[PDB]
Amino acid sequence: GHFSRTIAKGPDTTTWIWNLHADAHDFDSHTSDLEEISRKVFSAHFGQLSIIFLWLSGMYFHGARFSNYEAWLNDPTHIRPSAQVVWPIVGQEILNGDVGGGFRGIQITSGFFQIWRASGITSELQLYCTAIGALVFAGLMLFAGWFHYHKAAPKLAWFQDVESMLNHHLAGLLGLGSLSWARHQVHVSLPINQFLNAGVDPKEIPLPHEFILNRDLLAQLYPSFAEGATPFFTLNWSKYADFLTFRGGLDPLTGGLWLTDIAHHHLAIAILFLIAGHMYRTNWGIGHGIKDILEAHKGPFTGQGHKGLYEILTTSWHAQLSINLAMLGSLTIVVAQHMYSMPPYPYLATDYATQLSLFTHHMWIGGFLIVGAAAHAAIFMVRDYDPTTRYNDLLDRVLRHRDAIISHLNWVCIFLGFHSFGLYIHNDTMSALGRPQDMFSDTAIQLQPVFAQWIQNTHALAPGTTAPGATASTSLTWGGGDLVAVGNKVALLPIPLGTADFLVHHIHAFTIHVTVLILLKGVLFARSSRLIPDKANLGFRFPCDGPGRGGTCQVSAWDHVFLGLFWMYNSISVVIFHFSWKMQSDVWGSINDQGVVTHITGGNFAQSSITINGWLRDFLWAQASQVIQSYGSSLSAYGLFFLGAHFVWAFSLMFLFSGRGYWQELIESIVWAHNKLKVAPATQPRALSIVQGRAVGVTHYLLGGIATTWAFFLARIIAVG
């Protein structure tokens, strides 16, 4: 263990090697010095930023030299977005497929092509520069971490000034960041894209900087720019309304949100974050003591409340990390459900392959981060919770009636589980016995989601009534009778909600509640329990406390994250499935000359997603045919990864269904065979630890499982869309 001297000491077993990586980032276990830790993590963030910066550089670089972005620009409707090319070795070249534009490459789903068009990027020259600028930044970030750990590391007092940090981050980064981007839009994005929508061709577009210098070129369209003095200083602001609007809805030619709206959006967001930035107290008087305000809230129910919080969230990283992970993950989820319903990029909605993979990617990232909040919340209870020095009282009570919260949450899951999954087992049984009248269906006993249907109804009648400035709807899923069709593809359409939609939402209610149960139970009972009164002394990550008390396996808070990790998989895995089928069945499709719309699966969602057999046949078995028939084509890799994931998955069950006692005894026989032939390693081979075997197990389970759909989805939408 490099980090610690005794840890580094010497290796006698192979366990040392596994431990070395397991506690590599466990900074608070290497020192008790808070300042040393804080200094460590601060530099670590720099090293992170460098990697993602380098990551961005490669995306821009590949877009420049190894992509057909220019080719896609002239003909976005039926050119397939492709970056990265494969060298012709051991038969690889088959992965290079027809993507249009006289180019051989792998079709991509990151969506950079749609991003770049929105930014008004037109040439590889421009992409080439942005790649270098990113590399230059990557060099800075990496250097910056070295400088703030070996040359000039900040005091603990520096990090503790949370007020000053808050003011900046939601103003200096958010506000000006939104404002700065707002400027690029109306000066570069909006002018250039306006040309692109007129079929002018990229090379026939003037360079972005010519729009900024002379107003002439930018003023002929959006004639508010004509006045040099500008009506801004007149503070009338009504004149500006040509380049920015509150039109909403969707452009019928590009299928994305009007940049005419996004610019206005950021303009508002910017100063809204600039004003909200002027809140907390610093040095020049004006502002708030968050310590003071927090103290003020108290209650007949809470007694003292929030008192002492400021002390906790200024001396414990795991406390801050849990909160941030809980919402950053939650934010990623609402991002997924806002980009599908309100396509913000040109020719994004039309590109079905990108949309499925974008929504699905954000759902997992959001799902994982939330699970991580459970871990560090539990780590805080084990390592940083001290009532003697930092009592809160809010935390108390919670611990006081913890057997109550879990017991109730236990019940809700059983109620939800029955009233969700049971309905399906009902329908599966009534249909098998030949009685569809009996089933919970739109054709039989229907359970209409009238509440969701009512909220959508008011969103439709919103423009003009409760939203005068809004000419059109927010999203066309709330439209009513509107239909956008970019190319021969359908960008968006009002999404109906039936009894089949009532069931699946109740499954998400369920899966989320159970996931919450497992994780929350591990956080509250992390220190003490009737079973184990001194669990906190065993630590956060320990396998057990023996077979005693009937058996105390996975009593650790670590193991609660372990169990809740599978459930977060079970959860999302069915959200993305809901997304895939519903969009294919009732939204995505081709529109004809007459106006008749044919969907990919043809509206079979409403009466076939109410059955379990229906998902197993009309969804899995049906939509798999692509992946399992992708051999000999450009999507060959997806077919292999589909098989490859099924293996790393079943490979996990080996670790999950067994224990290390068997394996260690097996190794004994194998070490003997080695000692016979002088080939016994001085570093004695040991089996994985009880806890590691669980860690190894869940990783491969998630990998094989997640990866397996990845290949599922990406083979499906590409071959069909």
Partner: protein
């Protein structure tokens, strides 16, 4: 432009002036509305010549919208 200009540029500099009146307070030295308006209100008030031209353009923007 001319006089008209200088009259809007002075009322976009007097859009400022009205949130001077919130809080203006006065009562100097008696009663206390000043000391009270210099107690919690204001920790100076050309920080509110500055808080002026910020929110004032907003108040006009909203008073037309409200």
């Amino acid at each position: 432009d001319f006089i008209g200009s200088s009259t809007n540029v002075i009322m976009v500099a007097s859009t400022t002036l009205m949130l001077f009146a919130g809080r203006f307070g006065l009562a100097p030295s008696a009663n206390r509305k000043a000391t009270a308006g210099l107690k919690l209100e204001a920790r100076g008030d050309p920080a509110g010549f500055t808080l002026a031209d910020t929110l004032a353009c907003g108040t006009v923007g909203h008073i037309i919208g409200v």
